[PDB]
Design a protein around this nucleic acid. Structure first.
Ligand code: K
Ligand code: MG
Ligand code: MG
Ligand code: MG
Ligand code: MG
Ligand code: MG
Ligand code: MG
Ligand code: MG
Ligand code: MG
Ligand code: MG
Ligand code: MG
Lengths: 215, 135, 132, 224
RNA sequence: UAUACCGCCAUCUUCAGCAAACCCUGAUGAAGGCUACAAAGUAAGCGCAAGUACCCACGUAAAGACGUUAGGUCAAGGUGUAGCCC
RNA sequence: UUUAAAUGGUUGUUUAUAAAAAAAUUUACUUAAA
């Protein structure tokens, strides 16, 4: 009773049979989630649409991921991934930002319990790949605690709204290293041109930052 | 409920997370035992991939100093007439006896393998061992 | 393909009684006859008038007990007597059943000029032989 | 009021000791060596078994028995705790030379054996195959993890789907990635397989008797 | 108007397949699911089969699913839609 | 490895829910009076 189901896609797939010719089947993608991190998805197939809905709904609950939510409202860090030909680039956002993402990601996020996030889907906009990719990235996100333990260092959060106050969000449960992490003068990191282009005010889009209903 | 995603994490990680979320009302019987005495490696599914290019296995061939003696002995005399009894853990073969005598004479301080090999054979011949050379 | 009096397989959710579940080639092997009289015996007369009477009686009882009949009638004729055996449901009040038995027995006796009896057997629900 | 005390004295107490059932004494490195606990040829090696291989002696992988001892200690400890907790233990093996031996060992220790062809869905479709109220095994011990075409036994994947912990003897050609408590060792030589059966049968029997002794003492004390 | 249908049938059929409900594989794509010294299938129901009729356990009848040909039949009867009512 | 064997008019293929309800009677002779 805690879990809620929401349809993502309904497709009329067809095969050819010797006796009848075109045989119509229903392929249904559904996502189930209780809103507290536990969410899954499944594909249900049946000649009747009701049977397809049921099969997908009941099978999705046996394939539940657990999503680590930072402060139970957003992701811990920005996740960029490619699943097959679909690119999903998700950004961590502050409280009150909303779900500025593809309608399907909005639906899945509400089931997971993420309230604030931005995501841009590029490449193929296949619904199967998007869902499978979204759950792949969110499942693999590293929490602040896991980072502190791996690095043996404090994770200190700097917030602009709190000035210079150092907020320690995670500390290493084991021994704390005494050597500071080597500060590379120039980071050899791969930058997304779309990010850099926006930061330099070089991106004019009439469709970006349009006023939309509360999500 | 449970999670059948056997390729995402481990049974404990999945079970622990679902119990924390409240999906699993009661943790399974094995959960407490696993946590108390966990295995050395967490059982996470990983895909086997072919080694390409210069990648090689780290397994190294097991060799010993006496293998050089054993190889020479087997070439000179061949397999001993006595049949190897591998059931007996303390079984010594004619070749092993040669290695032992060879090593004992190495402690005496002979520095020439050929001379040392000849001396080793002579000591065995004196002890009554049958050493029929291939020739 | 043969069609006559065959209930056709569905998705396994159609309840059929024992009578309607058997096709015509079982009428003397697994199921019996719903009417027993002498008209169709060798050397016997008036098969036509017996048949018309059966067709009327089955329709009369279907409309006189609307929604009550749980299976087909069994019409029995012994000499001058006509006996109608009906398996009905337990939904209609007993008072209404007694009224309809007294009414139908009287009305049918005056119509076919013979003593007519109606024997009701009540079942809680339709007896399901199988789900087709 | 009484349940929590009962659970603490019985269920939680054994979990506070490193070797409550004293499974250390059941085996030594010498005993494992005398049972030929000898891998397959180097050409049969599985990539994931390399951390456990001591080396190759003339192209015959030698399993490191020092790791086997630590892995076996953890496997035998886990098995005992599950038998002490009245868990259903299922022995699975498709090696037909040892099917008779394994089926007897299970019956003798009051556990269960599945040495026959594993039909699709025994674990993931059990409620349909056995019944809605069927209880699945709590532990599955693989004495041979490969089927008869030298591929991982299907139950290894299915046990993980059902979140059932698995103990497994993993030879040098086996894939230990999904086995919870892998024990690197020879799974072919009768001497080796006879040792595993003796070790797991003893650990289960000991654990069950300890559960009866502890319960009896708790009950006698409870009355007076 | 059989190209709206019930009813009763032809045809492949001198076939053996149609399968609900689940499980698994494909990276959770349309789809696919066997090897007995067995390697993912379990399968209610329907047909075949088995039984029954005729002179036998033979033969012949009967039976013969889901579908294919918008196959036949508004002229067996009933009937949706449209039309006629000096 | 090994004869010949051409043709078939045009357009016509697959999405949104599902499902009624009841009813009153109200356990016990004969008679009779003013
Ligand atoms: K008409
Ligand atoms: Mg015919
Ligand atoms: Mg082996
Ligand atoms: Mg037609
Ligand atoms: Mg015509
Ligand atoms: Mg016959
Ligand atoms: Mg015929
Ligand atoms: Mg037949
Ligand atoms: Mg036509
Ligand atoms: Mg032409
Ligand atoms: Mg054409």
């Amino acid at each position: 009773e805690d879990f809620d189901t929401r349809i993502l896609e309904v497709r009329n797939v067809f095969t050819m049979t010797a006796k009848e010719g075109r045989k119509k089947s229903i392929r249904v993608l559904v996502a189930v989630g209780n809103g507290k991190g536990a969410a899954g998805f499944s594909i249900g197939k049946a000649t009747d649409r009701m049977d397809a809905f049921r099969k997908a709904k009941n099978r999705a609950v046996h394939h539940l991921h657990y999503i680590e939510r930072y402060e139970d409202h957003t992701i811990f860090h920005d996740i960029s991934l490619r699943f097959k030909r679909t690119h999903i680039k998700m950004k961590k956002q502050p409280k009150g930002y909303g779900l500025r993402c593809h309608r399907a990601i909005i639906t899945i996020c509400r089931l997971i319990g993420i309230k604030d996030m931005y995501a841009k889907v590029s490449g193929s906009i296949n619904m199967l790949s998007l869902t499978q990719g979204l759950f792949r990235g969110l499942s693999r996100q590293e929490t602040h605690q896991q980072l502190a333990d791996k690095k043996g260092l404090h994770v200190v959060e700097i917030r602009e709204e709190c000035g210079p106050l150092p907020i320690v969000v995670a500390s290493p449960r084991g021994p704390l290293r005494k050597d500071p992490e080597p500060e590379d003068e120039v980071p050899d990191v791969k930058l997304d041109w779309e990010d850099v282009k926006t930061a330099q005010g070089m991106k004019r889009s009439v469709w970006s930052n349009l006023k939309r209903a509360a999500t | 409920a449970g999670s059948r995603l056997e390729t995402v994490g481990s049974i404990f990680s999945r079970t622990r997370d679902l119990v924390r979320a409240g999906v699993l009302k009661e943790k399974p019987l094995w959960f407490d035992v696993y946590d108390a005495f966990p295995p050395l490696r967490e059982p996470v599914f990983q895909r086997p991939r072919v080694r390409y290019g210069k990648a090689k296995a780290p397994i190294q061939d097991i060799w010993y100093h006496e293998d050089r003696i054993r190889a020479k002995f087997y070439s000179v005399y061949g397999s001993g007439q006595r049949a190897f009894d591998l059931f007996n853990p303390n079984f010594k073969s004619t070749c092993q006896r040669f290695v032992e005598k060879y090593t004992e004479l190495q402690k005496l301080g002979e520095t020439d393998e050929e001379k040392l090999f000849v001396e080793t054979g002579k000591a065995l011949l004196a002890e009554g061992v049958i050493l029929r050379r291939v020739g | 393909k043969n069609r006559a009096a065959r209930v056709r397989v569905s998705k396994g959710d159609k309840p059929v009684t024992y009578e309607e579940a058997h096709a015509p080639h079982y009428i003397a092997h697994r199921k019996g006859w719903l009417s027993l009289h002498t008209g169709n015996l060798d050397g016997e007369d008036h098969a036509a008038e017996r048949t018309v009477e059966d067709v009327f009686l089955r329709k009369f009882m279907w409309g006189t007990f609307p929604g009550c009949l749980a299976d087909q009638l069994v019409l029995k004729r012994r000499g001058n007597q006509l006996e109608i055996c009906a398996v009905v449901l337990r939904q209609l009040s007993p008072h209404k059943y007694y009224f309809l038995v007294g009414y139908s027995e009287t009305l049918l006796s005056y119509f076919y000029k013979c003593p007519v009896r109606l024997h009701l057997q009540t079942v809680p629900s339709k007896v399901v032989y199988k789900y087709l | 009021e009484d349940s929590t005390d009962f659970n603490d004295k019985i269920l939680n107490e054994p979990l506070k000791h490193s070797d409550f059932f004293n499974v250390k004494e059941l085996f030594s490195v010498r005993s494992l060596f005398d049972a030929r606990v000898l891998g397959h040829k180097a050409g049969c090696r599985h990539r994931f078994m390399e951390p456990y291989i001591f080396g190759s002696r003339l192209d015959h992988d030698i399993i490191d028995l020092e790791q086997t001892a630590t892995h076996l200690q953890l496997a035998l400890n886990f098995t005992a705790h599950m038998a002490y907790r009245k868990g259903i233990i299922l022995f699975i093996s498709r090696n037909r030379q040892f099917s008779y031996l394994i089926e007897n060992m299970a019956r003798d220790c009051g556990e269960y054996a599945h040495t026959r062809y594993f039909r699709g869905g025994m674990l993931t479709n059990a409620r349909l195959l056995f019944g809605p109220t069927v209880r699945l095994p709590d532990l599955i011990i693989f004495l041979h993890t490969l089927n008869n075409i030298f591929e991982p036994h299907v139950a290894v994947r299915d046990a993980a789907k059902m979140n059932i912990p698995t103990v497994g003897i993993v030879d040098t050609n086996c894939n230990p990635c999904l086995i919870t408590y892998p024990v690197p060792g020879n799974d072919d030589s009768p001497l080796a397989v006879h040792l595993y059966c003796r070790l797991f049968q003893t650990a289960i029997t000991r654990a069950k008797e300890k559960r009866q002794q502890v319960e009896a003492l708790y009950r006698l004390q409870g009355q007076k």
